[PDB]
């Protein structure tokens, strides 16, 4: 949802490289959420995300 | 487009029945004009004693071609074909067509009349060059083996085609346009044969490839199996005369593809074809 | 940002009015991802108030004499009737233009959120709902490139050398760690990559890097601003008591490494390529551009490669062959 | 390979009129530089007999005697002799391979079959291929025949290499589809040969399948024919140096004619308290040093080179006809069209006695300055070169005509002419006649326009 | 280490989300009823409906303004993959064939390709000679370079934003509509300089006739043979005549910046190609207005890189230097908290 | 190229102009498209032809 | 098929025309036919023929060598080109077959 | 597809769009058949270069596709690329005389002689120079004279070729006069000279022993004007044994393919055939593509 | 593995323990020869680092 | 990657650090500490 790459599209290699960069960054950063961050603002931003 | 031709004369009903039998054939036209008389119709405005064949083939290039659509009792609907869409023609030529034949248009050789042959391209090409070499032989016909070559040169072999092409020379006299055509061929041959020896030197002072080497080898084979400091204006006259008498041979060296044919009616009296012209 | 934009020209006091007469001063648009930052960051300046927007388009009709002068002189003068009346009447100031008397007399409320920035009231507007499930990308996702640049393999001087980081790092005293030849960078992810000289080989051995023909061609356009008898004629050279003028390459060596780039230098206009020695010389009593190559790297000038730099280079070479203690 | 076989068959074609036998040649970096080889336009070569005249001109005598006539309107003989000298040379075939190579390796990469007596590893920096046909008048051949080479770059320059045919056919005659048989037979030997001056050597090839091998010519080298062929080559070289002799005796004549009080014809500030006995002594010491360093590349030879051109003689007649006319009449100036020598290109010999370095060819644009301005000598860039201030120089100036100035430092000059009447005419042309441009690839058709870039068949790029 | 020290340049295209603000009735839009034209096919009938918009500006000056607000990703790899010089000049081979083959084997390029002639370079807009890579996990890439002298004083030339030529060639600095003055400012050397008070800083890169001015300027590239399709980062700095053509009054160079000086790169290929009349995406290039570049975090040794990574926020802005080792820190922290906030 | 007489002689409409910068600075830096700056009084706006 | 395919172009142009070519190699004593499908951006036939002359010189010298080595035999042709139509840059899919190929069957234009 | 749009950089005043509506059903060469082009790739000025060659212009003009101009709308101009065999109207600008039933092709603009230089769309640094639409006899004459003038100018000094060119560069057709500005020796010109030499020598090999001596037999028999005119240059150059007619047929077939390959070096493809012409000769209808 | 491998940048970040990329998601879809060229052939460099 | 040192001193330093000391990566001469890319030894265990 960060970049509009919906189900009717083709993919250049640069697009897939950006998709993989976001995959690795968000599987690393927000894997275990509630065991790390106990502040209500970030959890609210995550839930509306 | 649409072409209307009429008749100021009077038309018999038997001739009406004769005319509607020519329902879809080709008629040449000197200018694409919407109304036209029937004295411009067909080839009867160009027949004489002296023109013969090369004038007719050179004249049918700059004329346009139509197809008859329908026949009324006093005006004939002539429909000019367009490129791409397919049409229906009738075989008025003695040749019978097959599928895939590229069709060519040719004047027929063998107080007003309507007369053109629609021959496929290879037969048209071979009778063109046959009439050409039969005009090349036409000055020395007193001998017998060249007369046997002429008699072999008359008849062509094709599927249901035993044709007797007429003699181009008549009363030991060739017609003047065939005379200019064969003269143009003889002079382009001679001018080539003596100017390539000078110009292969006058060109190979630049970057020379091996094609120039094999060219000069072929020329020395020619010059030894047969047998330079020229004035500029005579050289210019040589080259320009070469190219301008070459220029009046474009009608004979090419073949204007006119029709590409499709599936054929039985008895080969009509055929569906595309007008590629 | 809001107080830097000037106001408009068309006086339109009625349209886009909120309740209690608080007029709308502007409009802010962006993507939804910035609005989710701003509206969550600014929770004390956001209300869901309704504004009385116009309901119909501003239908503007053409006068007939406008059409006549349009056919005749290829131009339109808008509201020709008011111009014609006020010209021959005498007053030189019109009530309104042609566009303020069009686009009114229809009011319909709609609930779009506003913001308040010091008497200025700006309509905030996310534009996601026009572009979701749509083949075209947003114009508001503008692409901007930046030009980064960095040096590799440099040489800081030794007479001004120092360490502002002593407690943090400590390197072993090998020559390979006291003279730079590599450079480390950052990727998209925080991973330390490495550039060195070997990776630049798809550039460094091209023939255009060694071809000075357009260099010489543009240098000459600027222009200037018998061994047999020699062994006996060596003292014949010195009978004449004249001096020889100092050549240009020798004049490149009396400059220190820190002022060779200054404007006080003269011979910088002959320093054009690291692989050659472009110079002016005398031939047929005419200054000619003598394009000559350097063969070894020792022919580089002092200000461009000092002596101690070559000492450190040969120290690295002695390190590379396992000879850093010399016999 | 590309030109050798073709010009071999071409000389077989044209052997009947002029019995020219091919000499298949290759050159190297000793002949010319790489830059000179990349832009070599075309090659000229000349057959000249043992008597030493030509192969283009008349057999007995010519209209090229009556030595010089010292004129401006004809100024050699007119342009008929220029047409003759154009008809002497021939334009032989030509091909450049600007890439380093080994020659026997390259003929192995082609279809040619190489076998020498002993393997000679030849390795040069590029290759240019050229064939020459020396013309045997009868079937027999004279050993003291000599050749000429001309290498033309598109600027208009030329280099002349000359040598006898004796060194070309020394060892060879003592030991002695067509394109498919020519590769199968191939070469027999490779031979290097210097010129007559030993300044450049070059290599020749010898194919066994050439038609030279079946002609059965006869070869003789008589010593009195060699004695006269060097004498004809003596006068060909001497046309440059005895002209320098003709300048020097002119100076000694006019100085004895004047008496030693020579005037000023050049603008220089002077100083009276400076001694002049030191200046006169440096005239004599430096004047001989110019003769010690005389060369074909000199100002007085460059003064003649525009005069030996095609449209030089008729334009020179147009110059005096514009001068030698009446003053414009009062009826002329009101209704006739508008009627047209600002600065001229002079060439200069700069000698210097302090360092014995003498500069031979110098472009000088000189013009009359105002307020009784004698003469002032600027450069191409208005530099006002200022060598003639110094005490160390002496300078000689020539005009596009045969007018001549020998200038002392301080701008004091000796005004005289150039006499060439002792020089004959046919050797005056063939050394340095200005040859005309012949159209080739990349040349404009009409005479002169914005010319495009050079062809430059080079090795830095691909051929394409 | 050889006897020089190259600096690199690169362009990194970013995806930003720019917020826009405008005053009320800053523009009047004029529209009309839609107009229908009928195109005919065999079975379908494509109707082309057209509606015309005239957008008349209203205010005196810039009534509307924007600011680059929120980045979310980068597109290039931000890497060190050097520009393939053996495809931007596919004609230049070495003179000897065998040392050329040895160089091709020592490098990565395999064979020299023949350049296209005039007709085929007309009928095909570019070359695209480089082959797109198989696995692209990081994005596209570009890295050109300038050969510099190893005594380039980095302390005032590399820690601050600067022009990589050596001479500050920003065109606003000269008087507008002056041709001799800008050429004196960016080519000559018997005068001082802007932004540094020496004559030059890279004498193999400033004046005419360097390797830079024959290597990246499009005029001398056009005199030789080059590939017009490949994008270079140096083309905005070394195309001198475009910058001399850009010398105007400053409102006009603002209009030239935001309208006509918008560079474009194709984004669906693995390398950085120049578009063929780019109407898909116009990449806003702000560095062309200033003729400088930004310093990026480069570290000589791994230990100083590690002590840069170990610290907290604000560590990338500092610039520590060891004896011969040195850390040049970035002027704006877009490596500290860009990927942190993603 | 522009009819500057018709700008003077026609009945204008009145607005409060609010430039961002000074108006002569925007004129001398040619922000606008067509300019007719002069000084004093010009009789050019009278010769109606 | 991939073996009959060739070009002298990096195959990225929009209007990639196609041209069926056939050669007649006489390097062996018998006729050796080499059939090739040739795509190209260049559409005009004359300059394409100049390109084919610049690319296929071995067949030209083999043809004239067949002429000078066997004067009794008549040479048939040297090379025949016939257009078939055109495609796009994206219409290729590596056997490389074409998805949308508008046919334009013209005529056998020969060359020597 | 067919309808392509070209936008502009400068603004449009009334006179410029008036000159555009003067160019309805004109003809402009476009490269690559792009769907959207700028006005810099419009026309021919992006490729024109004096002292570069007429032959390279004549080459690369023929490779660009052709279109017509109609339906100007403002900051865009519509170009409709024609299809094969359809009837379109064409407005010429090159002042050559047109007649009905006549074929047309396209040559780069050779300057007319007064140097009229009518750009007919004014801008600062770019002009819309138009391609000439020239009937096939004049254009074939231009091609033949360009080839002849290219062939004669090899290995010649400037004077004789200048004396032949100052006559040869001029040409008339229905009371007109033309010259040729940039006739230089080019690589395409030299490779066409090479093709002409190879093909014409192949004609020289493929002549029978009777068609070389036919003209001598006519000069023996008759004496006509063209006979004497051919025989004059022919003498400046200077019973049948076996008649196997199939060998003469094969020799003439080889000679026919060689004369077609020789004739193709000057004769282009016909790209327009007229149908009717207006008597003021400013527009005519044509049935072909571009 | 080898005891000389690049410790400073291959082991501290998340990497594939084999050594090449093998992500199968920067490689083109349904292209097996490009897949084995990107995963095995050492003439082609690693895409990850 | 998971936190593995090679000597015991470098382990004892990261058991005396303040906060996020596992997430660093510091190296001695031949001994080294591979870092920790996700705080698994201060999230699961600290919540206990």
Author numbering:
A (entry chain B): 197 to 245
B (entry chain I): 6 to 115, 129 to 133, 135 to 246, 257 to 306
C (entry chain a): 246 to 470, 487 to 588
D (entry chain M): 1 to 176, 301 to 464, 468 to 591
E (entry chain a): 1029 to 1370
F (entry chain B): 1 to 49
G (entry chain g): 168 to 261, 273 to 290
H (entry chain h): 5 to 242, 255 to 306
What does the paper say about this structure?
The CVSC heteropentamer in the mature virion of HCMV consists of one pUL93, two pUL77 (the upper one and the lower one), and two pUL48 (the left one and the right one) molecules. The four-helix bundle extending to the vertex center is formed by pUL77 and pUL48, and is associated with the “base” protein, pUL93, via the N-terminal region of the lower pUL77 molecule. However, neither the peri-portal nor the peri-penton CVSC of the A- or B-capsid comprises this featured four-helix bundle. Based on the C1 reconstruction of the CVSC-binding penton vertex, we next built the atomic model for the B-capsid CVSC. We found that the B-capsid CVSC contains one pUL93 and two pUL77 molecules, but no pUL48 molecules. pUL93 in the B-capsid CVSC is essentially identical to that of the mature virion, whereas the two pUL77 proteins are only resolved in regions associated with pUL93, spanning residues 2–42 for the upper pUL77 protein, and residues 12–63 for the lower pUL77 protein. Given that the nuclear B-capsid lacks the portal cap, which is formed by pUL77, and that the portal cap is essential to secure the packaged DNA in place, pUL48 likely offers a supportive role in portal cap formation, presumably in establishing the featured four-helix bundle with the pUL77 molecules. Overall, our results demonstrate that the formation of CVSCs can be divided into two distinct steps and that the final inclusion of pUL48 would automatically result in the formation of the portal cap, regardless of whether the DNA is packaged.
